[PDB]
Amino acid sequence: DPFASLAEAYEAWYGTPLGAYVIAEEERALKGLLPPGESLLEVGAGTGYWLRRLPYPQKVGVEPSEAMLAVGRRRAPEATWVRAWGEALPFPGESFDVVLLFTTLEFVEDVERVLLEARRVLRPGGALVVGVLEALSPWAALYRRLGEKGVLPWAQARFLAREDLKALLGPPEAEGEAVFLAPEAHPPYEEADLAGRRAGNRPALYLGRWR
Amino acid sequence: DPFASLAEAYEAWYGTPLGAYVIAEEERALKGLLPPGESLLEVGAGTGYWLRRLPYPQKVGVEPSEAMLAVGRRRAPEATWVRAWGEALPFPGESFDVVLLFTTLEFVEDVERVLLEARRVLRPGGALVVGVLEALSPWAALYRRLGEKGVLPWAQARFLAREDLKALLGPPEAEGEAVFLAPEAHPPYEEADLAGRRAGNRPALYLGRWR
Ligand SMILES: Nc1ncnc2c1ncn2[C@@H]1O[C@H](CSCC[C@H](N)C(=O)O)[C@@H](O)[C@H]1O
Ligand SMILES: Nc1ncnc2c1ncn2[C@@H]1O[C@H](CSCC[C@H](N)C(=O)O)[C@@H](O)[C@H]1O
Question: Residue A138 is inside which H or E element, if any?
Fold first, then answer.
Protein backbone atom coordinates (compact mmCIF):
# COMPACT_ATOMS: atom_id res chain seq x y z
CA ASP A 1 0.00 0.00 0.00
CA PRO A 2 1.80 3.11 -1.40
CA PHE A 3 -0.57 5.38 0.51
CA ALA A 4 0.12 3.68 3.82
CA SER A 5 2.13 6.67 5.08
CA LEU A 6 0.54 9.50 3.07
CA ALA A 7 -2.95 9.64 4.60
CA GLU A 8 -2.41 12.27 7.28
CA ALA A 9 -0.83 14.98 5.13
CA TYR A 10 -2.45 13.93 1.85
CA GLU A 11 -4.36 17.23 1.64
CA ALA A 12 -1.62 19.50 2.99
CA TRP A 13 -0.67 20.62 -0.48
CA TYR A 14 -4.21 21.94 -1.10
CA GLY A 15 -3.43 24.56 1.51
CA THR A 16 -0.58 26.06 -0.51
CA PRO A 17 -1.24 28.78 -3.12
CA LEU A 18 -0.57 26.59 -6.13
CA GLY A 19 -2.25 23.55 -4.61
CA ALA A 20 -5.26 25.63 -3.61
CA TYR A 21 -5.52 26.78 -7.21
CA VAL A 22 -5.19 23.29 -8.62
CA ILE A 23 -7.77 21.72 -6.33
CA ALA A 24 -10.13 24.63 -6.97
CA GLU A 25 -9.92 24.20 -10.72
CA GLU A 26 -10.36 20.45 -10.52
CA GLU A 27 -13.48 20.69 -8.37
CA ARG A 28 -14.94 23.28 -10.75
CA ALA A 29 -14.32 20.96 -13.68
CA LEU A 30 -15.79 18.01 -11.78
CA LYS A 31 -18.90 20.00 -10.89
CA GLY A 32 -19.36 20.61 -14.59
CA LEU A 33 -19.80 16.88 -15.19
CA LEU A 34 -21.74 15.87 -12.07
CA PRO A 35 -25.23 14.73 -13.09
CA PRO A 36 -28.47 14.68 -11.05
CA GLY A 37 -28.84 11.65 -8.83
CA GLU A 38 -29.62 10.15 -5.47
CA SER A 39 -26.85 7.66 -4.78
CA LEU A 40 -23.14 8.15 -5.39
CA LEU A 41 -20.33 5.66 -5.05
CA GLU A 42 -16.70 6.75 -5.10
CA VAL A 43 -14.21 3.95 -5.72
CA GLY A 44 -10.90 4.86 -4.09
CA ALA A 45 -12.47 7.60 -1.96
CA GLY A 46 -9.17 7.95 -0.08
CA THR A 47 -9.38 10.71 2.52
CA GLY A 48 -12.92 11.44 1.36
CA TYR A 49 -12.08 14.84 -0.13
CA TRP A 50 -14.83 14.57 -2.72
CA LEU A 51 -17.28 12.66 -0.56
CA ARG A 52 -17.62 15.57 1.84
CA ARG A 53 -17.85 18.15 -0.95
CA LEU A 54 -20.38 16.43 -3.23
CA PRO A 55 -24.13 17.19 -2.67
CA TYR A 56 -25.64 13.74 -3.30
CA PRO A 57 -27.97 12.62 -0.46
CA GLN A 58 -26.71 9.03 -0.57
CA LYS A 59 -22.92 8.71 -0.51
CA VAL A 60 -20.78 5.57 -0.32
CA GLY A 61 -16.99 5.34 -0.31
CA VAL A 62 -14.95 2.26 -1.20
CA GLU A 63 -11.35 2.47 -0.01
CA PRO A 64 -8.93 -0.47 0.40
CA SER A 65 -6.15 1.42 2.19
CA GLU A 66 -6.64 1.13 5.94
CA ALA A 67 -4.56 4.29 6.33
CA MET A 68 -6.60 6.36 3.87
CA LEU A 69 -9.86 4.89 5.16
CA ALA A 70 -8.99 5.86 8.73
CA VAL A 71 -8.83 9.50 7.65
CA GLY A 72 -11.64 9.41 5.10
CA ARG A 73 -14.40 8.19 7.39
CA ARG A 74 -13.31 10.76 9.95
CA ARG A 75 -13.56 13.61 7.43
CA ALA A 76 -16.65 12.39 5.55
CA PRO A 77 -18.72 10.68 8.31
CA GLU A 78 -22.03 11.36 6.56
CA ALA A 79 -21.07 8.69 4.04
CA THR A 80 -20.96 4.92 4.41
CA TRP A 81 -17.35 3.73 4.27
CA VAL A 82 -16.63 0.27 2.86
CA ARG A 83 -13.24 -1.48 2.90
CA ALA A 84 -13.00 -3.16 -0.50
CA TRP A 85 -11.20 -3.14 -3.85
CA GLY A 86 -12.47 -1.66 -7.09
CA GLU A 87 -12.00 -5.06 -8.73
CA ALA A 88 -14.70 -6.56 -6.47
CA LEU A 89 -17.41 -4.17 -5.28
CA PRO A 90 -19.63 -5.75 -2.55
CA PHE A 91 -22.85 -4.33 -4.00
CA PRO A 92 -25.61 -5.91 -6.08
CA GLY A 93 -25.99 -4.78 -9.67
CA GLU A 94 -27.72 -1.53 -10.63
CA SER A 95 -27.55 0.07 -7.19
CA PHE A 96 -26.02 3.51 -7.87
CA ASP A 97 -26.95 6.53 -10.00
CA VAL A 98 -23.38 7.81 -10.20
CA VAL A 99 -19.99 6.14 -9.73
CA LEU A 100 -16.90 8.34 -9.37
CA LEU A 101 -13.29 7.38 -10.06
CA PHE A 102 -10.97 10.31 -9.39
CA THR A 103 -7.28 9.58 -10.08
CA THR A 104 -7.80 6.04 -8.85
CA LEU A 105 -7.27 4.06 -12.05
CA GLU A 106 -3.64 5.20 -11.77
CA PHE A 107 -3.30 2.88 -8.78
CA VAL A 108 -5.76 -0.02 -9.16
CA GLU A 109 -4.46 -3.50 -9.94
CA ASP A 110 -6.76 -4.14 -12.89
CA VAL A 111 -8.23 -1.20 -14.78
CA GLU A 112 -10.60 -3.04 -17.08
CA ARG A 113 -11.93 -5.07 -14.17
CA VAL A 114 -12.49 -1.96 -12.03
CA LEU A 115 -14.38 -0.36 -14.92
CA LEU A 116 -16.53 -3.46 -15.32
CA GLU A 117 -17.38 -3.43 -11.64
CA ALA A 118 -18.22 0.27 -11.90
CA ARG A 119 -20.70 -0.39 -14.71
CA ARG A 120 -22.31 -3.46 -13.08
CA VAL A 121 -22.97 -1.61 -9.84
CA LEU A 122 -24.23 1.29 -11.93
CA ARG A 123 -27.95 1.21 -12.63
CA PRO A 124 -29.56 1.55 -16.12
CA GLY A 125 -28.20 4.64 -17.86
CA GLY A 126 -26.10 5.30 -14.79
CA ALA A 127 -23.38 7.92 -14.92
CA LEU A 128 -19.75 6.85 -14.64
CA VAL A 129 -17.43 9.82 -14.08
CA VAL A 130 -13.70 9.17 -14.46
CA GLY A 131 -10.88 11.56 -13.70
CA VAL A 132 -7.21 10.94 -14.51
CA LEU A 133 -3.92 12.84 -14.55
CA GLU A 134 -3.57 13.12 -18.34
CA ALA A 135 -0.34 11.29 -19.14
CA LEU A 136 0.66 14.01 -21.61
CA SER A 137 0.71 16.96 -19.23
CA PRO A 138 3.88 18.45 -17.68
CA TRP A 139 2.49 17.25 -14.33
CA ALA A 140 2.73 13.68 -15.55
CA ALA A 141 6.32 14.49 -16.46
CA LEU A 142 6.93 15.57 -12.87
CA TYR A 143 5.17 12.59 -11.32
CA ARG A 144 6.84 10.10 -13.64
CA ARG A 145 10.21 11.54 -12.60
CA LEU A 146 9.30 11.56 -8.91
CA GLY A 147 8.13 7.98 -9.32
CA GLU A 148 11.36 6.59 -10.76
CA LYS A 149 13.08 8.71 -8.15
CA GLY A 150 11.29 6.40 -5.71
CA VAL A 151 8.76 8.89 -4.31
CA LEU A 152 5.43 7.45 -3.17
CA PRO A 153 2.86 6.83 -4.41
CA TRP A 154 4.19 7.81 -7.81
CA ALA A 155 6.65 4.92 -8.02
CA GLN A 156 3.64 2.61 -8.29
CA ALA A 157 1.41 4.71 -10.53
CA ARG A 158 0.44 4.09 -14.16
CA PHE A 159 -0.40 7.06 -16.36
CA LEU A 160 -3.40 7.31 -18.64
CA ALA A 161 -4.31 9.63 -21.48
CA ARG A 162 -7.88 10.51 -22.43
CA GLU A 163 -7.19 8.32 -25.46
CA ASP A 164 -6.84 5.26 -23.22
CA LEU A 165 -10.15 5.90 -21.48
CA LYS A 166 -12.03 6.44 -24.73
CA ALA A 167 -10.31 3.27 -25.88
CA LEU A 168 -11.82 1.44 -22.90
CA LEU A 169 -15.21 3.07 -22.39
CA GLY A 170 -15.84 4.41 -25.86
CA PRO A 171 -16.93 8.04 -26.57
CA PRO A 172 -17.85 9.98 -23.39
CA GLU A 173 -21.21 11.75 -23.20
CA ALA A 174 -19.38 14.78 -21.80
CA GLU A 175 -15.85 15.87 -20.95
CA GLY A 176 -14.02 18.27 -18.69
CA GLU A 177 -10.43 19.34 -18.11
CA ALA A 178 -8.50 21.48 -15.68
CA VAL A 179 -5.11 22.97 -14.86
CA PHE A 180 -3.19 23.94 -17.99
CA LEU A 181 -0.41 25.75 -16.16
CA ALA A 182 2.72 23.77 -15.25
CA PRO A 183 4.06 22.59 -11.85
CA GLU A 184 6.55 25.46 -11.69
CA ALA A 185 4.08 28.16 -12.65
CA HIS A 186 4.28 31.58 -11.03
CA PRO A 187 1.27 33.66 -9.88
CA PRO A 188 -1.08 35.28 -10.73
CA TYR A 189 -2.01 31.68 -11.52
CA GLU A 190 -4.89 32.54 -13.84
CA GLU A 191 -2.45 34.13 -16.30
CA ALA A 192 -0.15 31.11 -16.09
CA ASP A 193 -3.18 28.90 -16.62
CA LEU A 194 -4.49 30.67 -19.73
CA ALA A 195 -0.88 30.73 -20.98
CA GLY A 196 -0.52 27.00 -20.52
CA ARG A 197 -3.62 26.50 -22.64
CA ARG A 198 -2.26 28.64 -25.48
CA ALA A 199 1.09 26.86 -25.26
CA GLY A 200 -0.74 23.66 -26.13
CA ASN A 201 -0.36 21.92 -22.77
CA ARG A 202 -2.56 18.88 -22.18
CA PRO A 203 -4.47 19.57 -18.97
CA ALA A 204 -3.34 18.06 -15.68
CA LEU A 205 -6.83 16.62 -15.20
CA TYR A 206 -9.07 15.03 -17.78
CA LEU A 207 -12.68 14.15 -16.87
CA GLY A 208 -15.14 12.00 -18.79
CA ARG A 209 -18.75 10.93 -18.14
CA TRP A 210 -20.13 7.68 -19.58
CA ARG A 211 -23.65 6.24 -19.48
CA ASP B 1 20.36 -0.46 -31.59
CA PRO B 2 17.13 1.55 -31.09
CA PHE B 3 17.89 3.81 -34.07
CA ALA B 4 18.50 0.75 -36.27
CA SER B 5 15.64 1.79 -38.55
CA LEU B 6 15.14 5.49 -37.85
CA ALA B 7 18.16 6.91 -39.67
CA GLU B 8 16.36 7.63 -42.94
CA ALA B 9 13.23 9.31 -41.57
CA TYR B 10 15.02 10.72 -38.52
CA GLU B 11 15.07 14.28 -39.87
CA ALA B 12 11.60 14.05 -41.46
CA TRP B 13 9.69 15.79 -38.68
CA TYR B 14 11.91 18.87 -39.06
CA GLY B 15 9.95 19.34 -42.28
CA THR B 16 6.59 19.97 -40.59
CA PRO B 17 5.66 23.50 -39.42
CA LEU B 18 6.13 22.84 -35.70
CA GLY B 19 9.16 20.66 -36.33
CA ALA B 20 10.64 23.43 -38.45
CA TYR B 21 10.02 25.91 -35.63
CA VAL B 22 11.37 23.65 -32.90
CA ILE B 23 14.60 22.63 -34.63
CA ALA B 24 15.28 26.23 -35.64
CA GLU B 25 14.82 27.33 -32.05
CA GLU B 26 17.19 24.62 -30.87
CA GLU B 27 19.80 25.63 -33.44
CA ARG B 28 19.62 29.21 -32.27
CA ALA B 29 20.09 28.25 -28.62
CA LEU B 30 22.94 25.85 -29.47
CA LYS B 31 24.86 28.33 -31.60
CA GLY B 32 24.43 30.95 -28.90
CA LEU B 33 26.30 28.69 -26.48
CA LEU B 34 29.05 27.38 -28.79
CA PRO B 35 32.47 28.89 -27.87
CA PRO B 36 35.52 29.91 -29.95
CA GLY B 37 37.74 27.06 -31.13
CA GLU B 38 39.30 25.04 -33.94
CA SER B 39 38.32 21.46 -33.16
CA LEU B 40 34.95 19.91 -32.32
CA LEU B 41 33.96 16.39 -31.33
CA GLU B 42 30.31 15.34 -31.33
CA VAL B 43 29.59 12.15 -29.40
CA GLY B 44 26.52 10.45 -30.80
CA ALA B 45 26.63 12.66 -33.91
CA GLY B 46 23.87 10.56 -35.50
CA THR B 47 22.92 11.87 -38.94
CA GLY B 48 25.37 14.77 -38.71
CA TYR B 49 22.61 17.36 -38.44
CA TRP B 50 24.76 19.55 -36.19
CA LEU B 51 28.15 18.66 -37.68
CA ARG B 52 26.90 19.86 -41.06
CA ARG B 53 25.99 23.19 -39.45
CA LEU B 54 28.83 24.19 -37.10
CA PRO B 55 31.66 26.76 -37.79
CA TYR B 56 34.51 24.64 -36.40
CA PRO B 57 37.20 24.05 -39.09
CA GLN B 58 38.11 20.63 -37.75
CA LYS B 59 35.26 18.41 -36.60
CA VAL B 60 34.90 14.75 -35.70
CA GLY B 61 31.76 12.70 -35.24
CA VAL B 62 31.61 9.64 -32.99
CA GLU B 63 28.61 7.40 -33.69
CA PRO B 64 28.19 3.73 -32.64
CA SER B 65 25.11 3.10 -34.77
CA GLU B 66 26.11 1.92 -38.23
CA ALA B 67 22.59 2.74 -39.42
CA MET B 68 22.82 6.37 -38.26
CA LEU B 69 26.50 6.55 -39.24
CA ALA B 70 25.72 5.54 -42.82
CA VAL B 71 23.53 8.64 -43.09
CA GLY B 72 25.78 10.95 -41.09
CA ARG B 73 29.01 10.34 -43.00
CA ARG B 74 26.90 11.13 -46.04
CA ARG B 75 25.13 14.31 -44.89
CA ALA B 76 28.25 15.67 -43.20
CA PRO B 77 31.22 14.47 -45.31
CA GLU B 78 33.46 17.37 -44.31
CA ALA B 79 33.90 15.71 -40.93
CA THR B 80 35.77 12.60 -39.83
CA TRP B 81 33.33 9.87 -38.84
CA VAL B 82 34.52 7.45 -36.17
CA ARG B 83 32.57 4.33 -35.26
CA ALA B 84 32.91 4.05 -31.47
CA TRP B 85 31.04 4.54 -28.19
CA GLY B 86 31.15 7.56 -25.92
CA GLU B 87 32.26 5.25 -23.12
CA ALA B 88 35.55 4.68 -24.94
CA LEU B 89 36.70 7.47 -27.24
CA PRO B 90 39.59 6.35 -29.51
CA PHE B 91 41.42 9.65 -29.03
CA PRO B 92 44.33 10.77 -26.88
CA GLY B 93 43.63 13.22 -24.07
CA GLU B 94 43.48 16.97 -24.63
CA SER B 95 42.66 16.83 -28.32
CA PHE B 96 39.48 18.87 -28.80
CA ASP B 97 38.51 22.46 -28.03
CA VAL B 98 34.84 21.60 -27.85
CA VAL B 99 32.95 18.38 -27.19
CA LEU B 100 29.24 18.22 -27.96
CA LEU B 101 26.61 15.90 -26.48
CA PHE B 102 23.19 16.72 -27.87
CA THR B 103 20.36 14.47 -26.67
CA THR B 104 22.88 11.63 -26.51
CA LEU B 105 23.19 11.07 -22.75
CA GLU B 106 19.62 9.77 -22.73
CA PHE B 107 20.78 6.81 -24.84
CA VAL B 108 24.30 5.96 -23.68
CA GLU B 109 25.16 2.97 -21.47
CA ASP B 110 27.11 4.72 -18.73
CA VAL B 111 26.48 8.46 -18.40
CA GLU B 112 29.25 9.12 -15.89
CA ARG B 113 31.86 7.36 -18.01
CA VAL B 114 30.74 9.15 -21.16
CA LEU B 115 31.20 12.48 -19.35
CA LEU B 116 34.60 11.40 -18.01
CA GLU B 117 35.71 10.55 -21.55
CA ALA B 118 34.39 13.85 -22.86
CA ARG B 119 36.42 15.71 -20.26
CA ARG B 120 39.51 13.60 -20.89
CA VAL B 121 39.71 14.36 -24.62
CA LEU B 122 39.10 18.03 -23.95
CA ARG B 123 42.12 20.35 -24.32
CA PRO B 124 43.09 22.69 -21.47
CA GLY B 125 40.53 25.50 -21.43
CA GLY B 126 38.18 23.33 -23.44
CA ALA B 127 34.41 23.47 -23.19
CA LEU B 128 31.85 20.70 -22.86
CA VAL B 129 28.39 21.47 -24.24
CA VAL B 130 25.50 19.25 -23.28
CA GLY B 131 21.94 19.39 -24.52
CA VAL B 132 19.19 17.18 -23.10
CA LEU B 133 15.44 16.86 -23.43
CA GLU B 134 14.65 18.36 -20.02
CA ALA B 135 12.82 15.61 -18.15
CA LEU B 136 10.29 17.97 -16.61
CA SER B 137 8.99 19.37 -19.90
CA PRO B 138 5.73 18.32 -21.58
CA TRP B 139 7.84 16.76 -24.35
CA ALA B 140 9.37 14.41 -21.80
CA ALA B 141 5.83 13.37 -20.93
CA LEU B 142 5.18 12.57 -24.57
CA TYR B 143 8.33 10.54 -25.09
CA ARG B 144 8.03 8.60 -21.85
CA ARG B 145 4.55 7.62 -23.01
CA LEU B 146 5.71 6.78 -26.51
CA GLY B 147 8.51 4.75 -24.95
CA GLU B 148 5.95 2.93 -22.82
CA LYS B 149 3.87 2.14 -25.88
CA GLY B 150 6.94 0.61 -27.48
CA VAL B 151 7.88 3.35 -29.98
CA LEU B 152 11.64 3.48 -30.66
CA PRO B 153 14.03 4.82 -29.57
CA TRP B 154 12.13 6.22 -26.59
CA ALA B 155 11.62 2.76 -25.09
CA GLN B 156 15.36 2.79 -24.33
CA ALA B 157 15.67 6.39 -23.17
CA ARG B 158 16.48 7.79 -19.74
CA PHE B 159 15.57 11.44 -19.06
CA LEU B 160 17.62 14.13 -17.38
CA ALA B 161 16.79 17.40 -15.70
CA ARG B 162 19.25 20.26 -15.58
CA GLU B 163 19.67 19.34 -11.91
CA ASP B 164 20.97 15.92 -12.89
CA LEU B 165 23.62 17.55 -15.07
CA LYS B 166 24.59 19.96 -12.32
CA ALA B 167 25.08 17.01 -9.99
CA LEU B 168 27.31 15.33 -12.57
CA LEU B 169 29.34 18.26 -13.88
CA GLY B 170 28.83 20.92 -11.24
CA PRO B 171 27.47 24.43 -11.95
CA PRO B 172 27.76 25.20 -15.68
CA GLU B 173 29.61 28.28 -16.93
CA ALA B 174 26.70 29.26 -19.15
CA GLU B 175 23.27 27.91 -20.09
CA GLY B 176 20.78 27.81 -22.93
CA GLU B 177 17.08 26.91 -23.27
CA ALA B 178 14.64 26.33 -26.10
CA VAL B 179 11.07 25.36 -26.95
CA PHE B 180 8.67 26.19 -24.13
CA LEU B 181 5.62 25.36 -26.23
CA ALA B 182 4.05 21.94 -25.87
CA PRO B 183 3.96 19.13 -28.45
CA GLU B 184 0.40 20.17 -29.29
CA ALA B 185 0.94 23.88 -29.69
CA HIS B 186 -0.96 25.70 -32.42
CA PRO B 187 0.48 28.42 -34.69
CA PRO B 188 1.54 31.22 -34.53
CA TYR B 189 4.28 29.28 -32.76
CA GLU B 190 6.22 32.20 -31.32
CA GLU B 191 3.13 33.08 -29.22
CA ALA B 192 2.72 29.47 -28.15
CA ASP B 193 6.36 29.53 -27.04
CA LEU B 194 6.02 32.72 -25.00
CA ALA B 195 2.88 31.19 -23.50
CA GLY B 196 4.68 28.04 -22.42
CA ARG B 197 7.32 30.11 -20.69
CA ARG B 198 4.65 32.05 -18.77
CA ALA B 199 2.81 28.78 -18.08
CA GLY B 200 5.82 27.71 -16.05
CA ASN B 201 6.75 25.04 -18.60
CA ARG B 202 10.26 23.65 -18.53
CA PRO B 203 12.09 23.93 -21.89
CA ALA B 204 12.09 20.94 -24.24
CA LEU B 205 15.84 21.52 -24.61
CA TYR B 206 18.22 22.46 -21.83
CA LEU B 207 21.80 23.47 -22.70
CA GLY B 208 24.80 23.82 -20.43
CA ARG B 209 28.45 24.64 -20.99
CA TRP B 210 31.15 23.43 -18.60
CA ARG B 211 34.90 23.95 -18.55
N1 LIG C 1 -7.38 -1.65 -6.50
C2 LIG C 1 -7.96 -0.54 -5.91
N3 LIG C 1 -9.30 -0.47 -5.77
C4 LIG C 1 -9.89 0.60 -5.21
N5 LIG C 1 -9.17 1.64 -4.77
C6 LIG C 1 -7.82 1.65 -4.87
C7 LIG C 1 -7.16 0.54 -5.46
N8 LIG C 1 -5.84 0.80 -5.43
C9 LIG C 1 -5.64 1.96 -4.89
N10 LIG C 1 -6.83 2.53 -4.52
C11 LIG C 1 -7.04 3.84 -3.87
O12 LIG C 1 -7.08 4.90 -4.87
C13 LIG C 1 -6.76 6.14 -4.19
C14 LIG C 1 -5.94 7.02 -5.16
S15 LIG C 1 -5.66 8.68 -4.48
C16 LIG C 1 -7.22 9.51 -4.94
C17 LIG C 1 -8.19 9.51 -3.73
C18 LIG C 1 -9.50 10.29 -4.02
N19 LIG C 1 -10.17 9.75 -5.22
C20 LIG C 1 -9.21 11.76 -4.22
O21 LIG C 1 -8.99 12.24 -5.45
O22 LIG C 1 -9.18 12.50 -3.26
C23 LIG C 1 -5.94 5.78 -2.94
O24 LIG C 1 -6.60 6.24 -1.75
C25 LIG C 1 -5.83 4.24 -3.01
O26 LIG C 1 -5.81 3.62 -1.73
N1 LIG D 1 26.96 4.66 -25.83
C2 LIG D 1 26.87 5.60 -26.84
N3 LIG D 1 27.94 6.34 -27.18
C4 LIG D 1 27.88 7.26 -28.16
N5 LIG D 1 26.76 7.48 -28.84
C6 LIG D 1 25.64 6.79 -28.58
C7 LIG D 1 25.64 5.80 -27.55
N8 LIG D 1 24.40 5.27 -27.50
C9 LIG D 1 23.65 5.84 -28.39
N10 LIG D 1 24.37 6.79 -29.09
C11 LIG D 1 23.89 7.66 -30.20
O12 LIG D 1 23.32 8.91 -29.68
C13 LIG D 1 22.44 9.43 -30.71
C14 LIG D 1 21.22 10.09 -30.03
S15 LIG D 1 20.11 10.86 -31.26
C16 LIG D 1 20.90 12.48 -31.44
C17 LIG D 1 21.81 12.50 -32.69
C18 LIG D 1 22.41 13.90 -32.94
N19 LIG D 1 23.22 14.33 -31.79
C20 LIG D 1 21.30 14.92 -33.20
O21 LIG D 1 20.73 15.58 -32.16
O22 LIG D 1 20.94 15.15 -34.33
C23 LIG D 1 22.00 8.23 -31.58
O24 LIG D 1 22.38 8.43 -32.95
C25 LIG D 1 22.70 7.01 -30.95
O26 LIG D 1 23.10 6.03 -31.91
Answer: helix A138-148
